[PDB]
């Protein structure tokens, strides 16, 4: 996260770290959506242009974390993966359209003060809150600058951007399964996701029921925190029927 701040303890208890077993390293962010299911970006698991194609046994998920590098004894919980599910129409060839994946855990994780699931949006919450200017929150342990790494989880609040501005900021083809967020050059304030934040959540706190909803997944950007560029996020609600189909069939 560029131009964010240290998270408070328990501020993002759904935040998950996707951790490579060997070499031991941060791979991506992710989020906890129930006691057995973790949501992430498909490109965190499958990106053939970079020879990336992880299998279940390559990875662990670490839940309840605050420190990036410490083993947080008696606080974090480490889970093995039973199965990865990648959206069947994830477009890794072109533009990361439908950049979404689920991971089913081998055993349920115990909830605690530090471990708690986020809600997924219904159609009405998405319609109300996914509006230009409305702010969400992005969290992660990724790099602090494009070109370094945080001691603890970082957090930044960023406004959703009008779709024509998103489209006009890039040569990539934008789809309805993406939205973009970030400040404009004339707005002064700054902030963005960066390398290592991929797959983590963009959340909003509903003013109707005071619950946090995951509206986006950190998907892609061109650089980090560049003037006139925006971060792109998977539109979770647009892909929720797929999420529900997987959980109903395999949960």
């Amino acid at each position: 996260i560029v131009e964010g701040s240290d998270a408070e303890i328990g501020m993002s208890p759904w935040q998950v770290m996707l951790f490579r077993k060997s070499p031991q390293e941060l791979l991506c962010g992710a989020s906890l959506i129930s006691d057995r299911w973790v949501l992430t970006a498909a490109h965190c698991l499958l990106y053939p242009p970079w020879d990336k194609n992880f299998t279940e046994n390559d990875l662990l998920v670490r839940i309840g974390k605050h420190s990036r590098t410490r083993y947080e004894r008696n606080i974090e919980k480490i889970s093995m993966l039973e199965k990865i599910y990648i959206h069947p129409r994830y477009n890794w060839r072109e533009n990361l359209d439908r950049d979404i994946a689920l991971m089913k855990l081998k055993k349920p994780v115990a909830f605690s003060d530090y471990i708690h699931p986020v809600c997924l949006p219904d159609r009405e919450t998405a319609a109300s809150l996914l509006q230009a200017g409305y702010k969400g929150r992005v969290t992660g342990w990724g790099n602090l600058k494009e070109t370094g790494q945080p001691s603890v989880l970082q957090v930044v609040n960023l406004p959703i951007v009008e779709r024509p501005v998103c489209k006009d900021s890039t040569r990539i083809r934008i789809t309805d399964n993406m939205f973009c967020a970030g400040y404009k050059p004339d707005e002064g304030k700054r902030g963005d996701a960066c390398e290592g934040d991929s797959g983590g959540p963009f959340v909003m706190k509903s003013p109707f029921n005071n619950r946090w909803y995951q509206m986006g997944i950190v998907s892609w950007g061109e650089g980090c925190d560049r003037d006139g560029k925006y971060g792109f996020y998977t539109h979770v609600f647009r892909l929720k029927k797929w999420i529900q189909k997987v959980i109903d069939q395999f949960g």
Partner: peptide, 28 residues
Amino acid sequence: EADCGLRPLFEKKSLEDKTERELLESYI
């Protein structure tokens, strides 16, 4: 989950985090 999105150390205790108000103020 029935209690999704309600954080044990915040909403469940009626404590606010230091920047959630910024989000609320944007929901015009």
